[PDB]
Amino acid sequence: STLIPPPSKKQKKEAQLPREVAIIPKDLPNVSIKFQALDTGDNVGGALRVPGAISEKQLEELLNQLNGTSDDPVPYTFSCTKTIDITDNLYSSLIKPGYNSTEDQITLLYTPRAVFKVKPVTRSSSAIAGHGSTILCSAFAPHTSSRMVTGAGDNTARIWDCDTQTPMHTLKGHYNWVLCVSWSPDGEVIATGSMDNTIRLWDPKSGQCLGDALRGHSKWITSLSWEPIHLVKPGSKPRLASSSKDGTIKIWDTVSRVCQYTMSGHTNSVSCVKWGGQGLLYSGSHDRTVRVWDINSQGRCINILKSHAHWVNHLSLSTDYALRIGAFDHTGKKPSTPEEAQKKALENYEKICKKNGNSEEMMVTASDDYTMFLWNPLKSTKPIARMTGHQKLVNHVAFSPDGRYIVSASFDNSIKLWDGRDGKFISTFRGHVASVYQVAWSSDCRLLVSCSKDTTLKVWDVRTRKLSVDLPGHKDEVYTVDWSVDGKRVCSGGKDKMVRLWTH
Amino acid sequence: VQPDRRWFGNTRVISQDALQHFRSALGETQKDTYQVLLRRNKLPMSLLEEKDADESPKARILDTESYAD
Amino acid sequence: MQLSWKDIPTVAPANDLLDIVLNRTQRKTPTVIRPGFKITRIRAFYMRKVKYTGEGFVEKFEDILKGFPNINDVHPFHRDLMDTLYEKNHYKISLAAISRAKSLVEQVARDYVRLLKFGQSLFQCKQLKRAALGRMATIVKKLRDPLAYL
Amino acid sequence: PQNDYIERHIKQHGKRLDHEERKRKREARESHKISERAQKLTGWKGKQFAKKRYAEKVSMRKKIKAHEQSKVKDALPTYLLDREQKFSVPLPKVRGISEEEMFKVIKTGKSRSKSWKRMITKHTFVGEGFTRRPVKMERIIRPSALRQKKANVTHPELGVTVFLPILAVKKNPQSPMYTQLGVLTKGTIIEVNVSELGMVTAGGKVVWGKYAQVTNEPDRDGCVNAVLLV
RNA sequence: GCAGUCAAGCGUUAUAGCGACAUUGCUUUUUGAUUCGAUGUCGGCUCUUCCUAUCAUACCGAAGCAGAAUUCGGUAAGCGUUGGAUACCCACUAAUAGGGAACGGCUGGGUUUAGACCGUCGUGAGACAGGUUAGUUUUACCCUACUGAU
RNA sequence: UUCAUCUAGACAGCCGGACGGUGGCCAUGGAAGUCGGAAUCCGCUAAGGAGUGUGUAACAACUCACCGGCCGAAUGAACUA
Ligand SMILES: [Mg+2]
Ligand SMILES: [Mg+2]
């Protein structure tokens, strides 16, 4: 093993020299600050003088008082403008290096954050067997972290109990590789799209197949999407969108088990389909285009976005976490009524869509031309921004659960972190030595997990933009990774035919 | 050549901490004109020479459309 | 302006070009060498083979590169017309592939002449010359599609 | 003339009055002509004619087989489909190479009376920081044209070949003296930089150095080929 | 070249083992951008002939070969294939093709013996990793062949 | 040498048929079997491809795959020496 150089004699002597203590002076004068919001840029309180030894929580309490929510505080974070976060106190964060004098005002930008905290995963809880071929896809249940669904190449899906780390149900309806699995956003039905061009629905509590398979695709299923709960009217179930290599997007009513629309604009293989929160579907295909369809207008193509010079491989919406989660939360409470479920899902979707004046739903598209395009298709059809910098194809792209960051996983063994509003480059996560297949966020948007071709998982801390913990243990290439809604478990799977559950 | 299990082992490995150390250090080195290189350390320089670039290379057009098409 | 580009010599496809150049070597350079000669004579024989074949490929590639118009340096009307007719991206990529092949053939010839300076017998010298010509042939075979397009 | 003037000329004027008949008789004479060429061509042209005839017949048989086959009638994820790509060594025993073959006597002096300098006729790896010894005390000569730095390594897993830099010479089977001189002949064990292959140990360490065996004769083909020892 | 893939055959009752043709990876990536150790024999001049593996000249065949010009090919050695400058250039030219009879007569560099200097090594006599300068070998009237002559 | 065809008709030739849904769907300025991409079905048959090539800007016309009429006794294919 190659090692870092040892300290020299001089360095050992300076280490033996007595250390200085970073202390806070007691006569430190008051400093003028101006509060300002990151998303809206509203200056609240004007230039007010605060003690130089002010702490993060005391500053946060002052801000909650000035905004008028002292009874109901929401924890925020503070940044300074080079954007530097306020860690422990203002003196240590800014004054101690001396970048700004005390007499000068400091413009402190406050950003709301998540109330709950997700611990990093540090160890493999278990290595679970049962699949006879390579594992292709995995997802957690949206309401609980105790139920996981995994589809593999032995023509089967599997429902795993994460509590005992033991298999619970085997789903053996299909005739070929189960390419995609998806859980209903109300957590009631599992949809599996296969290599044999079929979509099969399953009851997870009994591990059973609902009727017969949905048919109509002439090529293998590539992606699945669910109708958002907040758009679904109470007393009715969401519809299922499916895409395939034949270039069509088929919409299925599961209540009556029929096909309502078959959108057919694309000319090559459709890579992905995402059902947005404003009654639209976004489809990405190998014909270098992204199509915007309106479900309210009998499945017609509204827009064609053409800015990619090669295949589009993936796309991600800003509200994707909320749309997948539906009415559930990080506490996973089951609503009393479908009415209250619909209202809570609507509020959860609105808290991310409608902000900074008007509701927006940004889309990001990751392509084979080594780039990504950031769009706001509701307002403009030209791209908002172009993100370049990757040396190989961008295989996976993901919006952060609060919609403030974009993470792009490429085949150049790298991940890149971008701003989720205007798409400017922030940082590069390095450490995978082989191509990074896909990535996943935590619920509180501080931790990111990536799986690679190098048979490893990696957990990254976003705020420090550095590697948190490297997780080996898989014997072969890892294809799929996911993080639970409550943030308690991470699942992974690949060529080793073993489902790996990881915990703190 | 005799059969031996030493032929099939790894000869050099490097940890993630060491990779991060050398990746950060390569860039904080300040060359002096009066210092000469007496001996170079042996490192995985392909792993270590990773720089953020503002621009991406152009796409390959022959994948989507061949000369005959 | 040139305004007209009829004076471009015929572009042979990859297999035909290989036949033309390799048979030109076999015809126009002497073919009889004996293991009983001086090693200096044997080495000069095989060096001449490698150098002559490399020059033949280089002259074909140069005749291709000099004849064809420069799409970005012509009048913009002609640039747009040739872009519509021939797809400028494919045009420049094919001509650049020819240029890369020219550089690789020159490098192969130089490397194997330098190696042939240290050959100790007819067998080794012959193997080195065959390796050089085979590498040139591999480079030319990788040009099959751009040559047909051009 | 402009655009497709020969096609327009044929459309407006036709062809020569004997065109179809002459072409038809030439095609009918083709069988006799092919037989005559096969029996009359000599030397290099005859050998090439026979070679091309064999290739054409193979191609026709493959086309017939494909037609009749048509007339009768890894488990990758979604983002990887529609995309394309005992501790015994593979060479336990190799040809013995004597010192007479390995070394060339270099004569020195005005009348060539001294014969103490020796030149290595094979390819070598001299390592990092190589400086030649002064000419008065240089007995062993390793010329710069025969020094190699990189090798074509084939991985048995995934069947890929990569051009990897050479780290060291571990074992030349001919002699430990050739090992310490860095001679690269067939069957030599070398250390290679495997950083671009992305290998990770069970403990999470990144592998960047492994062993390979040389499988060819670089003095004969001008390059180093090795198979990785996994 | 190494490593693989295919499979016409070879093989056989144990889908083992060989294996032509095809084919992929490395070498070697995309926008026509931008000299690295020959250890031991080389060259002129005059003059003849031979090979064809043909550069030109003759006649043919093919090609988006309009014409002009060119490219690739067939028969073909009858006939030519240069002047300079220091293996590359400049030019002229129809063209400035490759090779053998040596490398299994005068002459310049070279084996260059004795003189001499510089460099490296050697305690030294001296030797060389080397560099430079100066340095006599002189048939024919014999036979034959060849050119002419009785 | 081993397979096949054959007087309820061998091979070669000449003549005739070679159809209907239908210009099948997408795509194109145009594209009707015959620039392309995917399906390649059904009917009527003695037989007839959602077509083997020539051809047209697209059609047309010709062709051959297949079937029949005339003719009348052997014929074809792959292997070995
Ligand atoms: Mg000839
Ligand atoms: Mg002397």
mmCIF file of C-alpha atoms in Angstrom, chain D residues 17 154 176 191 194 222:
data_model
loop_
_atom_site.group_PDB
_atom_site.id
_atom_site.type_symbol
_atom_site.label_atom_id
_atom_site.label_comp_id
_atom_site.label_asym_id
_atom_site.label_seq_id
_atom_site.Cartn_x
_atom_site.Cartn_y
_atom_site.Cartn_z
ATOM 1 C CA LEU D 17 -27.572 1.091 -80.548
ATOM 2 C CA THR D 154 -5.173 -8.221 -22.071
ATOM 3 C CA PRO D 176 18.127 -13.265 -12.692
ATOM 4 C CA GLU D 191 4.424 -5.115 -13.055
ATOM 5 C CA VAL D 194 -3.865 -0.995 -13.699
ATOM 6 C CA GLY D 222 8.325 -4.271 -32.166
#
